Amino acid sequence: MKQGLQLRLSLAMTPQLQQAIRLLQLSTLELQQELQQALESNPLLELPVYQGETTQTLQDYLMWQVELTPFTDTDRAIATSIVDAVDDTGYLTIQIEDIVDSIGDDEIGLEEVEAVLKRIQRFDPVGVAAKDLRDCLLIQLSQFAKETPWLEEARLIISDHLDLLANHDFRTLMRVTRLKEEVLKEAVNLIQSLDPRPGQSIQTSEPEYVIPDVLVRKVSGRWTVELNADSIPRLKINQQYAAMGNSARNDADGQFIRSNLQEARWLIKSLESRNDTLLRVSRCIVEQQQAFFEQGEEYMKPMVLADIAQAVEMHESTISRVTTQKYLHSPRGIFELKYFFSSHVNTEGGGEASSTAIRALVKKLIAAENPAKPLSDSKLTSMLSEQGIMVARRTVAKYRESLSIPPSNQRKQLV
């Protein structure tokens, strides 16, 4: 306004201490390791008994079958080598030639290795070590009874018509195999129930860990959030060390204690401020993401980093630092902090939509479709434009790739 100079009264270059403090808040579990590392340097800052029960582990069964089955010593070694080349799904990871090379025996021939592999295939109750989907299907068909509807047709299709089934080219398969129309569907359905990856049944393991860091939930009609008390690290100044340093007879020892106390106080203040800033940022993010929190992913507001930065006094750089490897648990579930931010899509009615919400709606529409006639990407684009997509189906194509949606030709199948 009016030109003038300073007529009444009213910034900082953060050094390595505050600089590393800013470099902090990148993670939480990793932050604990660095905090322990600093606390090591800083001296003024502070039967029925459950034991593991062995399991088959999808390989001890194979070893037990090998031991029980009668095999030669060389045959036993080859069987052990084959068991080494195993997968959780149940297919042989390494090639037969690879097994022969690893054997390192002039005698070791491909015929003996093949005989051992064939014996092992029928050895375990679950058909395994097929190393080929066609081989596994053939093993399943052989195990299946001879008196089956279109069993020979299904075997012929599995033999060399795997590609036709892969592309769902039913017309091409019917033309090539000269199979019966609308009757080969029975053979296809029978082939569908062939237990692919049979070994995976013996494999079972789950994480059962989320390690939550924040807790936000609806209460009294409003979303309330709080940092996880257990997860947040805490530091305490060593009172005994502070007392010793204050009354230290040696001047040098007292000065060193004072320097250590200053460093520890700076670190503690930085940690507390980082935690508080993260809490405030999470509260601000929730204030605007309550719609997605309550209604679901479809009601996700298109939000950017600057949008969150505007509601707070911190910069977008602080927003990025806060939105770094942070996971928050809520009634909906566990989600990353960065998952909140989404692209803005122009839409009918003037509003902008979150690209994540658009992809979720697209997936919901695609799943709820007639299996006989799969929706075209152009058709899906028109359907979303009926809701105001303002998209050219290239972004829809990218979203479908993100969701691994198959082609309209591929999605279609026999009814």
Binding site: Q36, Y50, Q51, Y209, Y241, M244, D253, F256
Partner: protein, 50 residues
């Protein structure tokens, strides 16, 4: 021996090794920094009792 699945929470064998390891690390790091005799002696006594 995981109890909750999320946290294994070893006890009676590993908390002791954890204490000894961290205390020895702090003493070894501190001994190289020409610490005052009182603090290093107290840390050594902590290590011995651990």
């Amino acid at each position: 021996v995981p109890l909750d699945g999320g946290r294994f929470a070893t006890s009676d064998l590993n908390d002791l090794y954890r204490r000894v390891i961290n205390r020895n690390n702090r003493l070894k790091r501190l001994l190289d920094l020409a610490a005052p005799d009182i603090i290093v002696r107290n840390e050594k006594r902590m290590l011995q009792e651990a």
